[PDB]
Design a protein around this ligand. Sequence first.
Ligand code: PTY
Ligand code: NDP
Ligand code: 8Q1
Ligand code: SF4
Ligand code: SF4
Ligand code: SF4
Ligand code: ZN
Lengths: 62, 185, 331, 63, 385, 157, 169, 108, 60
Amino acid sequence: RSKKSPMELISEVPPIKVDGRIVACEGDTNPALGHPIEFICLDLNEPAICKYCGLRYVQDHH
Amino acid sequence: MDNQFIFKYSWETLPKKWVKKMERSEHGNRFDTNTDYLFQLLCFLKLHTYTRVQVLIDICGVDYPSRKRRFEVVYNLLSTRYNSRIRVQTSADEVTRISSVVSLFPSAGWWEREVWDMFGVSFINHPDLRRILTDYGFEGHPLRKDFPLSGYVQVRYDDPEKRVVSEPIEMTQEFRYFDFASPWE
Amino acid sequence: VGHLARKGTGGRSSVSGIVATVFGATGFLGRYLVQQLAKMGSQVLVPFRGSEDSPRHLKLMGDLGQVVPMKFDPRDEDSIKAVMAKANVVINLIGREYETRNFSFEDANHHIAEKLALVAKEHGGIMRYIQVSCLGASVSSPSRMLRAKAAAEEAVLNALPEATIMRPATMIGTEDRILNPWSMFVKKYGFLPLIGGGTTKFQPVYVVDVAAAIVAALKDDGSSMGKTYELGGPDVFTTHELAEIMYDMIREWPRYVKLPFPIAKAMAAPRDFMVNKVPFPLPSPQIFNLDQINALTTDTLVSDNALKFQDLDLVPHKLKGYPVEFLIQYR
Amino acid sequence: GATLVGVDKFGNKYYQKLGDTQYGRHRWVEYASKDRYNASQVPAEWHGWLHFITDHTGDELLS
Amino acid sequence: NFTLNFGPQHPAAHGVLRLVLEMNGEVVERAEPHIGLLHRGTEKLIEYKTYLQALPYFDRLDYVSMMAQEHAYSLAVEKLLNCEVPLRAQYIRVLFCEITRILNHLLALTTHAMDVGALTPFLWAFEEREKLLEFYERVSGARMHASFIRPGGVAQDLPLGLCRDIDSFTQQFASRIDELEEMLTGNRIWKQRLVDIGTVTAQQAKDWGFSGVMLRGSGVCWDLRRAAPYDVYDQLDFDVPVGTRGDCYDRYCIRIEEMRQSLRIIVQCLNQMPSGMIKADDRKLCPPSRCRMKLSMESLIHHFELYTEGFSVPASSTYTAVEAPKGEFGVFLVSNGSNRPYRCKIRAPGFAHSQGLDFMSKHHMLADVVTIIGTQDIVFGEVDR
Amino acid sequence: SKAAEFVISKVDDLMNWARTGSIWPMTFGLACCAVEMMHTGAARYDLDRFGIIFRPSPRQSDCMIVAGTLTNKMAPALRKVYDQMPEPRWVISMGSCANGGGYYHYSYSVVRGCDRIVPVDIYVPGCPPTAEALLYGLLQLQKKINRRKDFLHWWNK
Amino acid sequence: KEISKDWNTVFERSINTLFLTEMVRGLSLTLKYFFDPKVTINYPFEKGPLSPRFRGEHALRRYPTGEERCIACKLCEAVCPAQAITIEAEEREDGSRRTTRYDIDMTKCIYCGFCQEACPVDAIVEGPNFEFATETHEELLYDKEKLLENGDRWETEIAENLRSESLYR
Amino acid sequence: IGVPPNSANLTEARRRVFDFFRAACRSIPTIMDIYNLQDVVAPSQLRYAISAQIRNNAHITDPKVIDLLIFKGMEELTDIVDHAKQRHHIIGQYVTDFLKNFYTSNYF
Amino acid sequence: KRGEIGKVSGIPEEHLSRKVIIYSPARTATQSGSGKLGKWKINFVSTLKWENPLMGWTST
Ligand SMILES: CCCCCCCCCCCCCCCCCCCC(=O)O[C@H](COC(=O)CCCCCCCCCCCCCC)COP(=O)(O)OCCN
Ligand SMILES: NC(=O)C1=CN([C@@H]2O[C@H](COP(=O)(O)OP(=O)(O)OC[C@H]3O[C@@H](n4cnc5c(N)ncnc54)[C@H](OP(=O)(O)O)[C@@H]3O)[C@@H](O)[C@H]2O)C=CC1
Ligand SMILES: CCCCCCCCCCCC(=O)SCCNC(=O)CCNC(=O)[C@H](O)C(C)(C)COP(=O)(O)O
Ligand code: SF4
Ligand code: SF4
Ligand code: SF4
Ligand SMILES: [Zn+2]
């Protein structure tokens, strides 16, 4: 499919569940083939969006 | 011969009035002389027994649009016998004519012609001094800091007259100059 | 007004909202009109019908899509509407000098012009329309081609009231179709026949002047709309001194032979086109064209009370030096 | 034909011959179509194998 | 006397060559080449681009010895920057300079033979030349214009299987050279079309600035990689061929011997190549590894600040010269102190060689002019900067 | 006239086959792209297999390959040589410098594209284009020649 | 005075220069290659060898999720020696830094790989395609949709090439 | 022959101006019959054109500037003498207002 | 005044009458370093820069 631009296609990916105050996002599973690592403090109840990938991380606890 | 040996001997042997400015470093021995003593200095360096500079590498030219003597022609020389490299440079001007060295090194004719082509520095008693690199009818000297990179005129084919014609330049996309220079330097 | 939005200095990379659908731009006037249009930056669309390499010499005019050749079918109305869809001005130069086994004089000029005018009216976005006919375009003229031009230029006005009509007269240029065959024919034989017998005066014009007049009419949204100009040269020549001013640079041996007008017209038609209609691609006529002889029966001088170059503040080029200089390659 | 290595969704078939010490006639294509075949029908997965970029067949590259 | 002009379009004259020469009916009296047909304007363009953005201009100067000019530019930048280079980088740079020498000598010899009239060695030399163009295509992307040699070290490390293939090529390259030489040295037509043609004396070659093969043809044992050895050349042992009388044939024999010496040097570099880093640890002119720029803040900062601004060479001015296959290729940098070169004059060896055509083609016949053009191996990218 | 339409179709196909199976390009290489185009004519990527042989003169050459930077001083010569060519007269712009500016594209003495001097039909981009790229460009030119119903257009006009 | 005056050697030399021994020896060498196997390859069916580092078509990669890798960092535009890349950017309502116009003039491009090795996110790459041969000039002005189409087409091979040489540099 | 050294005084500059103008005139017929133009332009008006071009720089005072201008004059003349300049380049090269500027563009 | 060097420069004569501005660029507010000061430049007012009607490139 190609009618879905990345704008409305990245929003359909459910937010990641992770424990802890911060999470490290690297993009690809291989660090060298992803983006520079991006530690994000996911303390707000809204999911924290990685600035490079656009992936959203939310805190499972609390 | 050793680089410092050329320094000492040449500075001692040379007439004192010829060399205005002279420099010693690992980059290269430099003799900055006046515009009128250049021919005599080159002749001395060509014929002297200890300093036998037989081949002229090239005649350079640097434009400094911030000093009275705007241009600076650089003569790179090489002594094949003694395995040394000396560099002689002088200062020029838009209208000042500097003596040629074609009599000493016949290969310098094309370099002098291209220096005249690029910087507009005339050479005294140079046989057949004319533009060598730029096209026919070219206006302006491209290597000056004043000359725009894209030039002043274009080239295209015009159908009403079955020939290739010239117009003032009309760039489809301007040259984007990126200013990367930063402080703390 | 809304169109013709200037942008930057006039030149190759300039901008002008004169996106135009010039018909018949693969001909003689087209390579000059398109050059004039694209020299000042305006986009031009060149719809062709023949082989795809016919308009490839027009792409040199513009800058990366300012000259877009497109294919159409004159017999199909939809395609000729599709080619002019993104256009705000239409110039029509479609016209055949001679008969064709597929297209007659009426079909080549009158019917095509009527269809183009009706399609332009239907589109509704053509703010300026120009259709070009010949000078001696009287309805009663013996020549068939001139009658078709008259019918086309009268039908266009009814279709579009604000449509200018441009009327050049035997334009001469590097690949024109009245002087080049003469020099060619002289090269093989050199006797240079005169069908009219001389004393048939007319006004030749330089094709660059015609293109300049057309572009100037495009660039003035004033007292030009609807008017029918009569384009002509600065001097009133006739076939004799025209032949002399041709032959002077050509040189070698000058020879003149006079053919009586009626016997010449009675001889040219049978050999050229009276019964040979089986092969569709019949050879193109030489200077013995049947209707070109009929067009020479009367003087085609410009009307004294009609529009001229001086009404549109430009001067014709002198047809003695540069305009005729292209004959050196013939000499 | 020493060996036939895989096929393509477009129908063009891929062969392979192994030499001894000198290059030549290693691997080529038999295009399915004949209307001048546009000289460019190999997909991305089989493009690397054909140009000796990768030793993977291309069917394995899809997985 | 009439003055007809050249400009043939087939690659006999290497193209883009305009030659207006006056003859005495059969014998040429003065040939005046008209250069400038390929003056792109590199010297003016270098001043407008960073020290890294200007590197690929040097690939486009002498486009048969692409890595030879990059070598000179990198050495000039290093001399201005005072940057040390690891041994592995020096060894691979020497190896690829020798490969450029082989490529340029092969191309020169076979274009010269094509000009004379021999056709077979041309195709054999190109089927050889492809096997080194693919070596270039392996270490970097492009086959011809490979920006492999950077000012710091080299662009990136050699692939795993490159050394084995290079050795395999060098196993048979000598036999291929012998096969090519079989048809030219012993052939009697080749001697009569080259012997006593374009004689240059050592004093006259020195006067006209004929550094290169045209100098060693005249009996002068002047080699820039022996007189002023720059990279790892003292460790490598090779002989410098010197002609006895330089006239279009001792130059050819010298080129054969230099091809063999380049093969020997390549073998020595292959055997003696050490292991270690390829780019200097200064990190002011060398970028960080892709795994480090994505993990370390300083590495990313350096990558960002050198892939846009580039390194700033301290204000000075130097002249460097390397033994390019054509001859003495020299780059004269004047550094303003900013990240862009103030002036970069390029001393093309072909300039003086083409200048010296006028006297070399004196009182010769017309058919003894194409052989003079071929025997000096002039390409107009460098002649017209 | 449907009965003859088969005859015109066959004549057109024969003419296109004749013009495609034998193309005699004229080498106008004047920069480093000439070396790659010379490798294309070499033993490996044989051009002579496809009926392509280079000609030394424009008076007997089918198409023209512009390979290399086109300076201001050479553009009149390029146009003059292009003028002395027969009717088909195709032009191929090999290399990045030839098909619009190039690495320089900003110079007092560089023509920003050979398409400002001669009408170009096929653009082969690359700096320098691979021999396979030039072969693909020539195949594209051959495909373009196939789309020529020149006899049919003459019949219909 | 170059002399070869000996009774036996004069006969030996005067025969070699009379029966064309050198010509025959150089003639029999070509016949050896006449029967040898050829080195050519039929291009349309068999392609020449390449390398994982080859520099060909530009492509704009995207994350496996579907979000494009380009973050409008404009390092590629700044490092491009030919000045072929033009970039325009703005912040989408999602707040992500993305490109709206990212067009490469492939007629100015020199295929040097400086743009590819300057990306901090591997957004742009040079795929193994080398078969552009467009018939129109303005078709060579790739405009961020041709880039993305190339990235989608060659992704399964660009990823393999990148992961194969990721150990280098 | 070789380039003259310089001019110390303005009298030598005027002498060089006169010599250049004379040489340009003695070279006027060869450029008339090498470009194949006889009736389009008479040789007389080219003399007036050259005189006007020379008189254009009448306000120059530095002898060195005069010398370099004259040298450029010989360079252009020699270029024209050879069949090197493009065809009819020479004839093209050598041949209130406020509202007019306002109606065209803002930059006048 | 004293445009003799301008006359001999060879540049198109219509560009000799251009009005220019001479100034020393000031330190940028976004940075605190003063390593880009004390250098004077001539500012030709190249105001006219339209937009190419094919791709949005800035023509001049
Ligand atoms: C099996 C069937 C084959 C059928 C075809 C026949 C074989 C054809 C083979 C041709 C292969 C070579 C073709 C090359 C063509 C050009 C070669 C010409 C070279 C040439 O002319 O050299 C000359 C000698 O040639 C000559 O002299 C040639 C004539 C041979 C003379 C006879 C030699 C032995 C005589 C003994 C007689 C015995 C009987 C006595 C009772 C002199 O060369 P140069 O220039 O260096 O000289 C210095 C004087 N300026
Ligand atoms: N300038 C002059 O000498 C004169 C001009 N005129 C008028 O100006 C026009 C131009 O003169 P000229 O330059 O001689 O015109 P041309 O004879 O050069 O042909 C002009 C164009 O008409 C096109 N054309 C002809 N028939 C058809 C058709 N049936 N359907 C579609 N297109 C067609 C041709 O396309 P293709 O080539 O593909 O058929 C050609 O491009 C004349 O047609 C005439 O009306 C009047 C008097 C003299
Ligand atoms: C086809 C033609 C080929 C050559 C074309 C060349 C065209 C340009 C010619 C060169 C243009 C120059 O500026 S080159 C020559 C430039 N030299 C000068 O301008 C001298 C300055 N003028 C004076 O000295 C006096 O006023 C003077 C007017 C001489 C007399 O007036 P008086 O005695 O009262 O004093
Ligand atoms: S495209 Fe590249 S290789 Fe070809 S001429 Fe231009 S710079 Fe040289
Ligand atoms: S360098 Fe890569 S991420 Fe940055 S703007 Fe260019 S393509 Fe996008
Ligand atoms: S390959 Fe080089 S020239 Fe081409 S876009 Fe990338 S950086 Fe620019
Ligand atoms: Zn992330």
